[PDB]
Design a protein around this nucleic acid. Structure first.
Ligand SMILES: O=C(Nc1ccc(Oc2ncccn2)cc1C(=O)O)c1ccc(Cl)cc1Cl
Ligand SMILES: CC1=C(\C=C/C(C)=C\C=C\C(C)=C\C(=O)O)C(C)(C)CCC1
Ligand SMILES: [Zn+2]
Ligand SMILES: [Zn+2]
Ligand SMILES: [Zn+2]
Ligand SMILES: [Zn+2]
Lengths: 359, 8, 289, 9
DNA sequence: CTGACCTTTGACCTAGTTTG
DNA sequence: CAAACTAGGTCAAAGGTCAG
């Protein structure tokens, strides 16, 4: 709940006179309980969760700066955890959250929550698994054509064509999960049903990649609720056409993740994708634009504070949107040339629906 | 059109 | 009491998610830190032994991935005015058979562009190599953005800088009425209903210019950097010039997708009219293609 | 060429 | 480059501190 | 004393260095 005064991530309590992370804690003690002297530094190294162990002299400095002191070890259990439960500092909850800079912080929360329910495997569980800082059985890995043989994953309800199909499935499965999340967007279930659909007919694509970039990483992608992991190299080695399908996605993935966004953000960004007034074949547009503006206003704020340090991130994030079109339009070009020089399309109807006549 | 069955 | 899941040596415990030796541990580490990319000379079937593990890096790292050596478990090495892009200058530089009609224009404007570009701050300072890579990539988009703006006034067509309309029914005749209309409503219809400021159109074309993803850059960073500036100068210019429009900067950037989408579907036709030999084309255009 | 040329100064 | 040898981190558990 | 918490301690797993 409460952030650490020094590095930033979740704090394990009030330690040495200040709320700090378990790491910053042990650091502080190891320091003074050994009276250590780290090399100086004229560089005010901004200490942050991601890069905190870069410079000691600065991590120790920030420590003291925020109050790290052995003269404040306030042992034991806390009396009026409410005087301080004034929302930590209601100096914003009613002072910063306004004029309407509270609906935004509410819409975000609303979306985020709605997001949590619609999507089984968020980015958090994903990055959890990938870094091993989880608790579950390591993902089985599919690296050989042999490793594949030993390949049974519960997808909700040739070899290349077999893998691709697996994709088909999840894609469909998610065209659904996304659908729900849409209904949950404020004012969506309202706009002309004709457009509502049109907005998914196009949104889904762009949303998928985004989704599928949390499951992905430089070396592979996660499969089956993240119980399995397929190597970027295995996929890159399939039959002529099929060996490329997955690359573009991996490419986009690496670039996108450089942004280091969390679920709190993909919830708002995902929305910003659906509600777009530049889709081909839309009727009443003012109402669509209408919402998007709001969400955007929400999103910018969301970032501005969630990721304080970074700069232009918001502008940058929006940028990827022009990148997602580049893909979808192209990805389709392939679907064309493919259905041509190949039989057994075995395409799911739902996808058949959304692929028929796009860009 | 199949989508209808989802949003409706 | 274990053994490296990769080669067999005495594993000193768990490293990046698996039992392994100091060797494999450290090898996986540098490959990740430095972002190396190995390749196999033979047929990605090289056995990884406690003896011939250093035999092939590609096949070695690949086995690490197989025994599930989580790359994300490797940590970051423990070490290490708004007018830096004068909006002014930008605006300044910004001041300087129909398929054929079009093409005859593209060429004329294809030379102009370079002038516009060289006139964009910092651009020229970039390695001549990069200056080319850059212009080669977005010339398509760039040109569309410009004439797309110039056509704000007209009704159902576009202008070419050489003063020749090209209404709908006319393009449809040439069999390009669709891509064409797309231009009309995904760009013009938008820019107009927004009264797109020339300066803004100035910045956008500049951001389009500074595409750091173009393949073959002596230094992407420099370019990402440059583009990110324009994000600032432009954000500021908006913060000022339009205080009543909160998300103008946003709705202004959201113009970009439509542009790329169309730009792509445009080179579609070009290559086609080309090979077909369809109508005459000019030397500069041919160079771009 | 035509571009490299023009982008030579 | 490799990997053997050696130093920090920090998630988690013990012992001890204040409330209520 | 039960409830609610925090310095310290510990050890696996990270990081780093520099002959070879
Ligand atoms: O491509 C995807 N998934 C898979 C692709 C291949 C696969 O492999 C496979 N296919 C057929 C038979 C055996 N294995 C399994 C999955 C999965 O999600 O489980 C995918 C699509 C959309 C989204 Cl949102 C996420 C993923 Cl992971
Ligand atoms: C626009 C357009 C086309 C041509 C080429 C492109 C991509 C740009 C032309 C720019 C000009 C002619 C700019 C100017 O006058 O400044 C084609 C034939 C595919 C069909 C209709 C849409
Ligand atoms: Zn901390
Ligand atoms: Zn420092
Ligand atoms: Zn080993
Ligand atoms: Zn090999």
């Amino acid at each position: 709940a409460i952030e650490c005064r020094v590095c930033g991530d979740k704090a394990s309590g009030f330690h040495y006179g200040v709320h700090a992370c378990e790491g910053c804690k042990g650091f502080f003690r190891r320091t003074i309980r050994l009276k250590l002297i780290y090399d100086r530094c004229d560089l005010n190294c901004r200490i942050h969760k991601k890069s905190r162990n870069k410079c000691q002299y600065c991590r120790f400095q920030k420590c003291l700066a925020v109050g790290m002191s052995h003269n404040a070890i306030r042992f034991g259990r806390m009396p009026q955890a409410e005087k301080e439960k004034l929302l930590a500092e209601i100096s914003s909850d009613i002072d910063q959250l306004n004029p309407e800079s509270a609906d935004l912080r509410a819409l975000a929360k609303h979306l985020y929550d709605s997001y949590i329910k619609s999507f089984p495997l968020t980015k958090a569980k994903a990055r959890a698994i990938l870094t091993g800082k989880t608790t579950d059985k390591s993902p089985f890995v599919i690296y050989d054509m042999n490793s594949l043989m030993m390949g049974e994953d519960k997808i909700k309800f040739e070899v290349a064509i077999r893998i691709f199909q697996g994709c088909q499935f999840r894609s469909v499965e998610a065209v659904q999960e996304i659908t729900e999340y849409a209904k949950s967007i404020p004012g969506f279930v309202n706009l002309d049903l004709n457009d509502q659909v049109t907005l998914l007919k196009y949104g889904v694509h762009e949303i998928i990649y985004t989704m599928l970039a949390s499951l992905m990483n430089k070396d592979g992608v996660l499969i089956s609720e993240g119980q399995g992991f397929m190597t970027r190299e295995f996929l890159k080695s399939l039959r002529k056409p099929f060996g490329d399908f997955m690359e573009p996605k991996f490419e986009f993935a690496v670039k996108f993740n450089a942004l280091e966004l969390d679920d709190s953000d993909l919830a708002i960004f995902i929305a910003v994708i659906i509600l777009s007034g530049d889709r081909p074949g839309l009727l009443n547009v003012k109402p669509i634009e209408d919402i998007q503006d709001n969400l955007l206003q929400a999103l910018e704020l969301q970032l501005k504070l969630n990721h304080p340090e970074s700069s232009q991130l918001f502008a940058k994030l929006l940028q990827k949107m022009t990148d997602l079109r580049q893909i979808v339009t192209e990805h389709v070009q392939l679907l064309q040339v493919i259905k041509k020089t190949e039989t057994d399309m075995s395409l799911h109807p739902l996808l058949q629906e959304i692929y028929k006549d796009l860009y | 059109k199949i989508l209808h069955r989802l949003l409706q | 009491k274990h053994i490296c899941a990769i080669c067999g040596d005495r594993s000193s415990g768990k490293h990046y998610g698996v039992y392994s030796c100091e060797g494999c541990k450290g090898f996986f580490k540098r490959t990740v830190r430095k972002d190396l990319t190995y390749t196999c000379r033979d047929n990605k079937d090289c056995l990884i032994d406690k003896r011939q593990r250093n035999r092939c890096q590609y096949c070695r790292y690949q086995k690490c991935l197989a025994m599930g050596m989580k790359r994300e478990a490797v940590q970051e090495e423990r070490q290490r005015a708004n007018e830096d892009m004068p909006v002014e200058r930008i605006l300044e530089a910004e001041l300087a058979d129909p398929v054929t009609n079009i093409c005859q224009a593209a060429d004329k404007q294809l030379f102009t562009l370079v002038e516009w570009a060289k006139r964009i701050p910092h651009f020229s300072e970039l390695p001549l190599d990069d200056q080319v890579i850059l212009l080669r990539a977005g010339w398509n988009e760039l040109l569309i953005a410009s004439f797309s703006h110039r056509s704000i006034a007209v009704k159902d067509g576009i202008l070419l800088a050489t003063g020749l309309h090209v209404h709908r029914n006319s393009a449809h005749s040439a069999g390009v009425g669709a891509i064409f209309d797309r231009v009309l409503t995904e760009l013009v219809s938008k820019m107009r209903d927004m009264q797109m400021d020339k300066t803004e159109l100035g910045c956008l074309r500049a951001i389009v210019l500074f595409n750091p993803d173009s393949k073959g850059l002596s230094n992407p960073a420099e370019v990402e950097a440059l583009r990110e500036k324009v994000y600032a100068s432009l954000e500021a210019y908006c913060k000022h010039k339009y205080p009543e429009q909160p998300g103008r900067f946003a709705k202004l950037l959201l113009r970009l997708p439509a542009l790329r989408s169309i730009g792509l579907k445009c080179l579609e036709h070009l290559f086609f009219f080309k090979l077909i030999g369809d109508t005459p084309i000019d030397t500069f255009l041919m160079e771009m293609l």
